[PDB]
Ligand binder design. Sequence first.
Ligand SMILES: [Cl-]
Ligand SMILES: [Cl-]
Ligand SMILES: [Zn+2]
Ligand SMILES: [Zn+2]
Ligand SMILES: [Zn+2]
Length: 128
Amino acid sequence: DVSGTWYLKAMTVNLESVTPMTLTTLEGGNLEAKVTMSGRCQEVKAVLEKTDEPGKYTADGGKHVAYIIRSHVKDHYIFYSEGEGKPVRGVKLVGRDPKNNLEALEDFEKAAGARGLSTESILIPRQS
Ligand SMILES: [Cl-]
Ligand SMILES: [Cl-]
Ligand SMILES: [Zn+2]
Ligand SMILES: [Zn+2]
Ligand SMILES: [Zn+2]
C-alpha cells in the first residue's frame, strides 16, 4: 500500500524538496500527507482527495493533482504532480529506507522522459 514514511531519492527541477513525508490512509480512501518543517519546528498536514481514477488524487482545492506511479523496485514509488503563479509539474522518486541507495533511478528517468521532462535538472538529497 502507499501508506508509510517516504524518503525523497530524486526529483526533477525548496518546499517541494522537504523529506520525509508520511502518508496515512483515511476512512473513505483519502490520504493525509504530513511533513515536519521562520519560527518553531512544526508538523504540517494536508488531505489528498481520492478521485474516481486509480492512483490519481487532488489537493489544494483542486489546483494540485498528484499521481502515484508504481516502480519495479520494491518499497519505492514515483509521484508525478501538476500544480500552479505559473503552472509547474515534476516527478519525484521516493522510498521507505532512510538511506539513499540510488538503485531505482532507471524508473525515475523513464517516468520523466514519458512526460516530456527528460532535459530538466535532477536534485538528489543525501540527508533529511
Ligand atoms: Cl533507496
Ligand atoms: Cl533510489
Ligand atoms: Zn484524470
Ligand atoms: Zn532506492
Ligand atoms: Zn523499471
